[PDB]
Design an enzyme around this catalytic site. Structure first.
Site, PDB file in Angstrom:
ATOM      1  N   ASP A  15       0.774  -1.241   0.000  1.00 51.95           N
ATOM      2  CA  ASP A  15       0.000   0.000   0.000  1.00 51.95           C
ATOM      3  C   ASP A  15       0.804   1.290   0.000  1.00 51.95           C
ATOM      4  OD1 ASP A  15      -1.177  -0.500   3.429  1.00 51.95           O
ATOM      5  OD2 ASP A  15       0.678   0.311   2.633  1.00 51.95           O
ATOM      6  N   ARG A  29       0.537   6.896  -0.149  1.00 47.43           N
ATOM      7  CA  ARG A  29      -0.093   5.844   0.646  1.00 47.43           C
ATOM      8  C   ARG A  29      -1.485   5.679   0.002  1.00 47.43           C
ATOM      9  NH1 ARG A  29      -2.945   2.595   2.947  1.00 47.43           N
ATOM     10  NH2 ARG A  29      -2.608   1.842   5.098  1.00 47.43           N
ATOM     11  N   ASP A  34      -5.635  -1.020   3.612  1.00 52.02           N
ATOM     12  CA  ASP A  34      -4.541  -1.485   4.438  1.00 52.02           C
ATOM     13  C   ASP A  34      -4.119  -2.899   4.021  1.00 52.02           C
ATOM     14  OD1 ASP A  34      -2.532  -1.213   6.293  1.00 52.02           O
ATOM     15  OD2 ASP A  34      -3.691  -2.236   7.767  1.00 52.02           O
ATOM     16  N   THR A  35      -2.895  -2.948   3.497  1.00 54.21           N
ATOM     17  CA  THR A  35      -2.347  -4.261   3.149  1.00 54.21           C
ATOM     18  C   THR A  35      -1.504  -4.611   4.392  1.00 54.21           C
ATOM     19  OG1 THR A  35      -0.432  -3.273   2.060  1.00 54.21           O
ATOM     20  CG2 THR A  35      -2.347  -3.972   0.598  1.00 54.21           C
ATOM     21  N   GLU A  37       1.376  -5.591   6.846  1.00 57.91           N
ATOM     22  CA  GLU A  37       2.662  -5.062   7.238  1.00 57.91           C
ATOM     23  C   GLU A  37       3.723  -6.123   6.977  1.00 57.91           C
ATOM     24  OE1 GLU A  37       3.241  -1.821   8.534  1.00 57.91           O
ATOM     25  OE2 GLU A  37       5.182  -2.626   7.725  1.00 57.91           O
ATOM     26  N   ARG A  81       2.998  11.658   3.501  1.00 54.74           N
ATOM     27  CA  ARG A  81       2.766  10.752   2.334  1.00 54.74           C
ATOM     28  C   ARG A  81       1.539  11.259   1.576  1.00 54.74           C
ATOM     29  NH1 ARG A  81       2.426   4.950   5.287  1.00 54.74           N
ATOM     30  NH2 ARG A  81       0.731   6.171   6.281  1.00 54.74           N
TER      31      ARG A  81
HETATM   32  C1  LIG Z   1      -4.452   5.564   4.578  1.00 52.73           C
HETATM   33  C2  LIG Z   1      -4.197   6.610   5.639  1.00 52.73           C
HETATM   34  C3  LIG Z   1      -3.294   6.371   6.675  1.00 52.73           C
HETATM   35  N1  LIG Z   1      -3.099   7.381   7.586  1.00 52.73           N
HETATM   36  C4  LIG Z   1      -2.376   7.116   8.879  1.00 52.73           C
HETATM   37  C5  LIG Z   1      -3.185   6.315   9.877  1.00 52.73           C
HETATM   38  C6  LIG Z   1      -2.019   5.540  10.559  1.00 52.73           C
HETATM   39  O1  LIG Z   1      -1.194   6.314  11.487  1.00 52.73           O
HETATM   40  P1  LIG Z   1      -0.392   5.614  12.706  1.00 52.73           P
HETATM   41  O2  LIG Z   1       0.998   5.429  12.245  1.00 52.73           O
HETATM   42  O3  LIG Z   1      -0.648   6.361  13.943  1.00 52.73           O
HETATM   43  O4  LIG Z   1      -1.053   4.162  12.826  1.00 52.73           O
HETATM   44  C7  LIG Z   1      -1.157   5.159   9.370  1.00 52.73           C
HETATM   45  C8  LIG Z   1      -1.505   3.868   8.670  1.00 52.73           C
HETATM   46  O5  LIG Z   1      -0.482   3.656   7.700  1.00 52.73           O
HETATM   47  P2  LIG Z   1       0.270   2.313   7.370  1.00 52.73           P
HETATM   48  O6  LIG Z   1      -0.605   1.177   7.022  1.00 52.73           O
HETATM   49  O7  LIG Z   1       1.229   2.674   6.298  1.00 52.73           O
HETATM   50  O8  LIG Z   1       0.997   1.986   8.746  1.00 52.73           O
HETATM   51  O9  LIG Z   1      -1.317   6.245   8.480  1.00 52.73           O
HETATM   52  C9  LIG Z   1      -3.731   8.580   7.553  1.00 52.73           C
HETATM   53  O10 LIG Z   1      -3.480   9.432   8.422  1.00 52.73           O
HETATM   54  N2  LIG Z   1      -4.644   8.767   6.578  1.00 52.73           N
HETATM   55  C10 LIG Z   1      -4.892   7.818   5.609  1.00 52.73           C
HETATM   56  O11 LIG Z   1      -5.756   8.177   4.806  1.00 52.73           O
HETATM   57 CA   LIG Z   2      -0.334  -1.129   5.571  1.00 50.31          CA
END
Ligand SMILES: Cc1cn([C@H]2C[C@H](OP(=O)(O)O)[C@@H](COP(=O)(O)O)O2)c(=O)[nH]c1=O
Ligand SMILES: [Ca+2]
Length: 135
Positions: A15, A29, A34-35, A37, A81
């Site tokens: 992702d 992103r 969510d794919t 980790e 991102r």
């Molecule tokens: C997809 C997406 C992720 N994010 C944030 C939520 C999560 O923050 P936290 O790091 O606090 O969990 C993280 C999830 O991304 P990843 O799946 O890349 O970890 O990115 C956003 O803020 N907005 C979005 O639209």
């Molecule tokens: Ca992910």
């Protein structure tokens, strides 16, 4: 929403991909999914992590054209991102992943949810066909 051209730099995981956008390198992103980790230790290397990464990689690397589509709310997350729907030869990567059971619909933040229902229908189908994640 409007699509704009981007050039692949490097696929990072299922992702997250690095793209050249408006002449600048950026990490994108994928909105609404969510794919699993493959990186964070606090998560480990979740099941299908590797499969999801391969799928995205293949998809973006083999494409003639890549396009990014920003939603109507914020265009960057707190990590800087870009948040978009990414298309490979007119096919939405975000949906292709969900449709294959390689990602779940997640991180739904209004107003960034234009394709939520669309992604939700693909996910139900993936679930009902018990694919990967849902298997
Ligand atoms: C997809 C997406 C992720 N994010 C944030 C939520 C999560 O923050 P936290 O790091 O606090 O969990 C993280 C999830 O991304 P990843 O799946 O890349 O970890 O990115 C956003 O803020 N907005 C979005 O639209
Ligand atoms: Ca992910």
């Amino acid at each position: 929403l409007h699509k704009e051209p981007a050039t692949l730099i490097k696929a990072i995981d299922g992702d997250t991909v690095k793209l050249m956008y408006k002449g600048q390198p950026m990490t994108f992103r994928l909105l609404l999914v969510d794919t699993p980790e493959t990186k964070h230790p606090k998560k480990g290397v979740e099941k299908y992590g590797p499969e999801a990464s391969a799928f995205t990689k293949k998809m973006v690397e083999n494409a003639k054209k890549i396009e990014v589509e920003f939603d109507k709310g914020q265009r960057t997350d707190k990590y800087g991102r870009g948040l978009a729907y990414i298309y490979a030869d007119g096919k939405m990567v975000n949906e292709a992943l969900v449709r294959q059971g390689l990602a779940k619909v997640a991180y739904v933040y209004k107003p960034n949810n234009t394709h939520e229902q669309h992604l939700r229908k693909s996910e139900a189908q993936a679930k009902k066909e018990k694919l990967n994640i849902w298997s």
